[PDB]
Amino acid sequence: TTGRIVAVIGAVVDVQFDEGLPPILNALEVQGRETRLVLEVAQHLGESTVRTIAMDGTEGLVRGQKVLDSGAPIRIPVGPETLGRIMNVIGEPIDERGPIKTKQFAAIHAEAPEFVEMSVEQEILVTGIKVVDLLAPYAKGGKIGLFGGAGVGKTVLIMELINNVAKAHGGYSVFAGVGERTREGNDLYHEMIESGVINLKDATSKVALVYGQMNEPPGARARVALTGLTVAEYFRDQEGQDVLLFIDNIFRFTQAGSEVSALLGRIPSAVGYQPTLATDMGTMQERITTTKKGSITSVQAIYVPADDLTDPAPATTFAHLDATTVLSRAIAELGIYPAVDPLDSTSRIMDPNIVGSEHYDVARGVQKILQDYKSLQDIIAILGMDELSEEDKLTVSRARKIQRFLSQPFQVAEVFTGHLGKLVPLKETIKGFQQILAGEYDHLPEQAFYMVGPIEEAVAKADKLAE
Amino acid sequence: TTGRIVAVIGAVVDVQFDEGLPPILNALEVQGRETRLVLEVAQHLGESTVRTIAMDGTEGLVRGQKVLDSGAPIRIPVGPETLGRIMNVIGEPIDERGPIKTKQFAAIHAEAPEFVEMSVEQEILVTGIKVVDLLAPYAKGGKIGLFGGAGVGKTVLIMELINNVAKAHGGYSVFAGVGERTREGNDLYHEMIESGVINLKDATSKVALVYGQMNEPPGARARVALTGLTVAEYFRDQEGQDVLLFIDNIFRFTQAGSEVSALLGRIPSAVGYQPTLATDMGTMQERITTTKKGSITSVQAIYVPADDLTDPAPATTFAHLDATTVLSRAIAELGIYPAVDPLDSTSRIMDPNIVGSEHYDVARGVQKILQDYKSLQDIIAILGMDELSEEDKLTVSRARKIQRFLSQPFQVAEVFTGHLGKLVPLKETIKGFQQILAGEYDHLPEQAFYMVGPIEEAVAKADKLA
Amino acid sequence: STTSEQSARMTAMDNASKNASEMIDKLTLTFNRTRQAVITKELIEIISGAAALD
């Protein structure tokens, strides 16, 4: 059935139909376009008119232009042949390697798995990153979120996770580039070809790529996360095998929605957001999950506007996670990388019954010493260190060493640090912090602990800083 | 031809025309008023109806009332015969001295001078005011703005500049009162009659006055700046002459625009302001300028709402200035007058290649010690100066002497200071601060540097005490 | 030396305590004006978005 455009304002296009009205979520095809222009039905306005969101630019559209109902929501290629390829929001190849030679397709809108479909299994996923493994460990098949303001380290961390966890992964990975830098998509693509994770000449590729970056209009940015997760859902349910899903950046899904909200005729909620922020997020997030059929370990970069973690977008995201890594500009600004806030990062599996009492005790001990120092800092900035008991100033010096031993040079960050990348086994992470807490390095200079891997390197650095 | 009023809300009057529609910016004349009531066309609404802004009160207006198109924007008298006269927003004499019989009139809307007309000449204008001359000096033909919250010293400073600058000046001056105190206009007028810069008997007056004060409805407050500028533009272009333009207070222009925008039914921007705040400001400000054809040294007082320099009005004004003098309530309350913030006042000519390396180095030296002092303020607030190290106590003590030496008795504020006004030559300003920075006066008490002119007066003052 | 030190610490710590007290008032009043303004500004943004519709 056929309609005609009646209004165009930015990404929002109104289309009138004389006969059969297309249901909400249906994909509509604009006629007379050089490249495929999809409109997704968002509302029935009445008077046989639907309001839509465009998946690409609306420049050149005319009132009266023909629009065809496809009879379904956006459907994209799924299956083995997505591996090694790059797709856009509507499933077209954007790697100039010709058609996605698949004969299996899936709608990007789908129901979330039911309560009966949930899995309660939770085992540690060691990352080799000291701060994460010690304080707020990731779980295999769990939901991981990386929070941060602009420029504090979300992408560097996700790239390091890809390096330490995904490069040696036995199953499939999906990376979804959502409203981020096209330059980062190109960096990643060529890095994966170099690492062999993507292979252009054979069928051994282990990663499927999906991109709709910040050069795209909001419709594309609003739906590209669903496209990427639809690919992942196939691998979870139809191949069964363990899937890793990386999303950078899932905030961009909510932001895209806020860009079009007023033009969809909604009264704003607080801070300019769509009234539907939480239910929109819920319908999307509840699909990003391990089920009884298959495991998805999901790692989502989550942007924090104006550095305010109370911003409705990140605030609403927390409840959807099993482990949260919260980055901080106040920490990054000191040169402490990765810029993880040790006092604002949590994990479901940080439990003495799960990680063992030794791991738990050292992690809680570390958090106590850091919180104790943080609560003293401002008092001693005025009254002076000299006013402290030898007990308090001992915990100040120790806390400052622990802060530094939490920093780590990343393999993916060598161009920023000037230091070789380091991966630290969980056992060594635990041991190192245990020793610092016990006062076993009270004699060593603060700086020996900064930007090293294992504790032995701090000892070695102490000798080097002498002469 | 003629139109009829269809709607009135405050300053906003809608008018329907049956034969021919007046263009935007056209001045309309309301028929049957005891005093001339001009409406300025702002928008075409559709259905042969224009939305207009009134230049005076709209009480007594009735729907169906007749309105005539004058066929032009507001036009005012320009030229020699404006000198010594006072006019309102629509160019009428308000001094009870009869017609202003100029040979020319000019519309109050004119396009800003184009890029090709700009002058790049940069030359110091010495004020004799220590803070300004040292840290953020004014330029001849440059744009000067004086920022301040309520009662901090904007008008005293502009009056002192009229005293210090507008006599060593051999051209013409224009003063525009915009949304300020009517009695301040009365004060200035009669002072100028007394001094002789306005002569009521001969053609020797050198100043033209234009006023639309805080008793006026917003359309008048919004346009009276353009009236003043237009008078300035004539002398700049048609006489080519060196012109001084003083405006107290340009904020009132933007505030007036906010009042009308509320009535024009626009969607508001941040802090309830008109969405057009920046372009409105731009279209007006860009006319306040020196060109290759003639020089305008402009000094504008800029009110700061609730002392907040991030308020859209003052915030947007910074980029239009070549020199800023930013006043501070906290500094005023410490008794430092003029209450200039030495770390928030800037000038484009503060450049070693323009003022010389000596001037430049002394200025940067002063701002360094003052910032170093400022950076210690958290600890001093709690614990006092005594808890500081030897080195820090030296910088604090030198900075406090510098702070005090930046204060100055103004001729205009003698009643409030109890000190005779002082004008300090530039080289003496440089020398005095140079000497303090070098530690030549470490032995002299702070208070000796307070409310004096040259450094010698601080020495003589210190000799008196102990 | 100590009798002078103990009395000078008395004087200094009394004066510090007074200053702290005066700063607490200043900051509390800054806190509250900011608390109120944040609520007011957020509400005006909402009202403005709502009025701009249909």
Binding site: D386, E387 | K393 | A8, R9, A12, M13
Partner: peptide, 26 residues
């Protein structure tokens, strides 16, 4: 021989600075 007396503890205004190869008080 001088040799300068104060104490170990600060927060006493100018006590140390007013008096200031041995010296008693840290």
């Amino acid at each position: 021989l001088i040799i300068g007396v104060s104490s170990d503890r600060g927060l006493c205004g100018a006590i140390h600075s007013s008096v200031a190869i041995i010296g008693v008080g840290d």
